[PDB]
Amino acid sequence: EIEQYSVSATYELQREDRALVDTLKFVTQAEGAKQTEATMTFKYNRQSMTLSSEVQIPDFDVDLGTILRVNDESTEGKTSYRLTLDIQNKKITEVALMGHLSCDTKEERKIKGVISIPRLQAEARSEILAHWSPAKLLLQMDSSATAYGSTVSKRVAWHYDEEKIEFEWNTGTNVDTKKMTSNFPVDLSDYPKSLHMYANRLLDHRVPQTDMTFRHVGSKLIVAMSSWLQKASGSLPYTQTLQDHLNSLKEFNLQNMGLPDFHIPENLFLKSDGRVKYTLNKNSLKIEIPLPFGGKSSRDLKMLETVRTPALHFKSVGFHLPSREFQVPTFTIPKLYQLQVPLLGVLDLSTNVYSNLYNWSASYSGGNTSTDHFSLRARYHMKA
């Protein structure tokens, strides 16, 4: 069926509509009726900065598809990109990594990140925005992560203003018991069958010269220990769930791993509230310090923008070394500096903690409410 073998590393250049794919394939098949196809192809779209990797191995059904799509959307006044990592296992997208960037150079600086897993429910967020402003400054942050129903949040926002300056923080972390139980697979594909077969083996095998099996003594011991448990104090539904578990265990057959009883509260909340309120009366001070020798571009630093190594083509020894072009991140020198000069009070803080069965509140606003009228009210409060 196979007349011979041949392995090749032929490089081709595919016509992707308008774009060109530097398709390099490494097939290792056997010539003849029996094709031992095992090809490691790694496509590259140089016209669209797209990298792909293909490996088909039907011997173990290994058909992995890795596609790296990069969108060049950066312009002279709008720097943007769309990073995409599509991890397909057996052509099934199981890990996807998408990034959205709209970091403009004028006011808006949108930085985003998408992290989710369709198979295991592992959703994570990373979104950054920073609204540029010559006078004030506006900035935000987003970083959320939910995996198996583990809700984690962090909400911190700060904004500058001539009147007031505010700064809050919110560390959200709530993990629910039933949500964990449902999201996390708590049942094994091969476990109830094993328990049933173990119970069958235990029942269908015992000492001779008699017919009682160990299940009778096991039920006796479960009854005795249940009687001892109910002998002591404590009237909770967890005890009744335990009794049901014991009755099920009497036959030596369960449904899941461990103990289904959940003594913890179904809602497990843990939050750290807090803020900063910082008054600057009504106006701020925006000093525009002149910066001499400013506004220069990359070429004025006596440095090159792109580093190009000497391409070495020596025919005597056949040495080939192309020009590796390295891009130096550009930076522009500001001509003026915006400096914010603050003012006096009023000052105020508040922070509240909400842990499980714990609601602690605090509030204090110090500082004279009026500089020119001397109305001081520095009152605090602590509640738990």
Q: Which residue has the tokens 């011979």?
A: 4
Beta-carbon contacts of 102 under 8 Å, excluding residues fewer than 6 positions away, are 78, 80, 108, 109, 110, 112
CA quadruple 179, 183, 187, 190: dihedral, nearest 10: 180
d(CA 160, CA 338): 13
Give me the phi and psi of 302, to 5 degrees please: 60, 20
Query: What's CA 29's distance to the chain center, in Å?
Result: 40
Closest CA to 68 of 21, 11, 25, 124: 21
Closest CA to 163 of 55, 49, 283, 51: 283
Experimental approach was cryo-EM
Beta-carbon contacts of 288 under 8 Å, excluding residues fewer than 6 positions away, are 336, 337, 338, 339
Neighbours of 165 (CB within 10 A): 19
By the 8 A CB rule, do 275 and 165 touch?
no
Q: Which residues of 39-137 form beta strands (DSSP E)?
A: 39-41, 44-45, 50-57, 62-72, 81-89, 92-103, 109-111, 114-116, 122-125, 127-131
d(CA 43, CA 50): 8
3-state SS assignment for residue 286: strand
d(CA 252, CA 246): 9
3-state SS assignment for residue 218: helix
Question: In Å, what resolution does this model reach?
Answer: 9.0
- Is the omega angle on the peptide bond into residue 346 within 30 degrees of 0, that is, cis? yes
Residue type, 69: R
d(CA 16, CA 82): 20
d(CA 1, CA 30): 9
Q: What angle do CA 315, 320, 325 make, to 5 degrees?
A: 140
Buried b (16+ CB within 10 A) or exposed e, 127-137: ebbbeeeeebe
Question: What kind and span of H or E run contains 272?
Answer: strand 269-279
